A paper describes a structure:
For comparison, we found that the DH522 lineage antibodies bound natively glycosylated and glycan-deleted CH505 TF gp120 Envs equally well, but did not neutralize [name]-1 pseudoviruses bearing these Envs nor bound free N-glycans.
We report here the immunogenicity in rhesus macaques and CH103 CD4-binding site bnAb UCA KI mice of sequential Env immunogens derived from the CH505 [name]-1-infected individual who made the CH103 bnAb lineage. In macaques, vaccine-induced nAbs  had epitopes overlapping that of CH103, bound only open trimers, and neutralized rare tier 2 viruses. The antibody clonal lineage most similar to CH103 we identified was an IGHV4-J, CH505 differential-binding clonal lineage (DH522) with autologous tier 1, and heterologous tier 1 and weak tier 2 neutralization activities derived from memory B cells of RM-5556 immunized with additive CH505 Envs. DH522 lineage mAbs did not neutralize tier 2 CH505 TF, neutralized 7% of a panel of 199 [name]-1 primary isolates, and blocked the binding of CH103 lineage Ab (CH106) to CH505 TF gp120.
Author numbering:
A (entry chain H): 1 to 35, 35A, 36 to 52, 52A, 53 to 82, 82A, 82B, 82C, ...
B (entry chain L): 3 to 6, 8 to 27, 27A, 27B, 27C, 28 to 95, 95A, 96 to 106, ...
């Protein structure tokens, strides 16, 4: 099945160039589609950036950005890409790739049936910082009988995002990862908690797997009772 | 661009119609308007294309129409799950594309729910770095509004607090968190700290101590 998968740096310095790529699977980039980019500045609406046409490579861009935008295809790799030059804080947004599908353009136009997952790009002169991860030792009082809550605190990272799993993704039931808080320092923090059987404590190991791709850092933090 | 109302609000089980006013060069130039649903933090999802067509897997509760240069999305039998931003969009003459500004849908009438409050003390290791973060995790409440007050030995703490805006959980209730950032010296100089969460006139207070 058709899938669009986005990748690219989530941190760009002002006046530098933003680059993203959209890897297509389940179909050919050479087919009759308008391979498109769309963005969404924080708390604002969707904004069209432009497209490249799969069968010929013709492009068209939003005139608000036509000066700064380049959209390209790499037929090997089955991908298309976005380059946005001379960025400013106004370009901070979630960027989406999407497939524009059509029948007869002059009668019905086209529409976006498949979408990439979206990549947040932050335009900032602040530098990348990896998180410090701290265990939150089990606490039984706020959970059901025979269970306890334990977690890990992911402190002081930049930029977003961080993802958390437990026991390498083998533990999924009862997991709750909370949205990040933004500190006055400009750094983010979040917490992830999981509710586990009180019986299992001491015998079963619990490890939170914290991934911060923007700093190419992963931390696997074991969580145990305090001593 | 394409003009949508910033918000609409209706109650559970009701219908709602969202308008999208464009021009004869887009909505009125083609049978080509499409509609997208976007939940916070996820990609837009196609609901309607070619004015009124639904992709397979989209609920028949969604329908679309147009009259002149205005398109309309109607959602029947409103559920909590339908709360989202809704966008219209269309091809426009001259080989371009335009989105509407988006409409945020609020669905009222959902049941009240009190928050669960989970409060963790600082870890040994953070303390060795002369820092102490108290973590107050607030979950399963509705509506998505809470007030958090931190206390040290019962007296109000105002400095060093950061509290998130509530966000929907998969079960359509809300979650938020509050952090109190202290020094280790501050942590060790009080008998206790408390996170007090107030919601709909009721308060849950949890306490932790250096022990
Ligand atoms: Cl607790």
């Amino acid at each position: 099945q058709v899938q669009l998968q986005e990748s690219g740096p989530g941190l760009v310095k002002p006046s530098e160039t933003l680059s993203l790529t959209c890897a297509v699977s389940g179909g050919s980039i050479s087919d009759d589609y308008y391979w498109s980019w769309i963005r969404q500045p924080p708390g604002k609406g969707l904004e069209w950036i432009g497209y490249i046409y799969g069968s010929g490579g013709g492009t068209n861009y939003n005139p608000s950005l036509k000066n700064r935008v380049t959209i390209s295809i790499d037929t090997s790799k089955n991908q298309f890409s976005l380059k946005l030059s001379s960025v400013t804080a106004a370009d901070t947004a979630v960027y989406y790739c999407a497939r524009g599908s059509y029948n007869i353009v002059v009668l019905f136009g086209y529409y976006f049936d498949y979408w990439g997952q979206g990549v947040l790009v932050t335009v900032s002169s602040a530098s990348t910082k990896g998180p410090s991860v701290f265990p939150l030792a089990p606490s039984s009082r706020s959970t059901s009988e025979s269970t306890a809550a334990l977690g890990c605190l992911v402190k002081d990272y930049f930029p977003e995002p961080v993802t958390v799993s437990w026991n390498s993704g083998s533990l999924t039931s009862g997991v709750h990862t909370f949205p990040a808080v933004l500190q006055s320092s400009g750094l983010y923090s979040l917490s992830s908690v999981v509710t586990v059987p009180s019986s299992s404590l001491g015998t079963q190991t619990y490890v939170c797997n914290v991934n911060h791709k923007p700093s190419n850092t992963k931390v696997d933090k074991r969580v145990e009772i305090k001593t | 661009a394409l003009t949508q109302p910033p918000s609409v609000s209706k109650s559970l089980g009701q219908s709602v119609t969202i308008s999208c006013t464009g021009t004869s060069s887009d909505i009125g130039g083609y049978n080509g308007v499409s509609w997208y649903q976007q939940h916070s933090g996820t990609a837009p999802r196609l609901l309607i294309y070619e004015v009124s067509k639904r992709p397979s897997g989209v609920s028949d509760r969604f329908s679309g129409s147009k009259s002149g240069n205005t398109a309309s999305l109607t959602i029947s039998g409103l559920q909590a799950e339908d709360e989202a931003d809704y966008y219209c969009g269309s091809y426009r003459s001259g080989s371009t594309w335009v989105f509407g500004g988006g409409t945020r849908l609020t669905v009222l009438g959902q049941p009240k729910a009190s928050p669960t409050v989970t409060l963790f003390p600082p870890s040994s290791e953070e303390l060795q770095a002369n820092k102490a973060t108290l973590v107050c995790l607030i979950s399963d409440f509705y509506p998505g509004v809470v007030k958090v007050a931190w206390k040290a030995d019962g007296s109000a703490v105002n400095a060093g607090v950061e509290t998130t805006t509530p966000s929907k959980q998969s079960n359509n209730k809300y979650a938020a968190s509050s952090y109190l950032s202290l020094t280790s010296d501050q942590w060790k100089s009080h008998k206790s700290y408390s996170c007090q969460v107030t919601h709909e006139g009721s308060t849950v207070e949890k306490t932790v101590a250096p022990a």
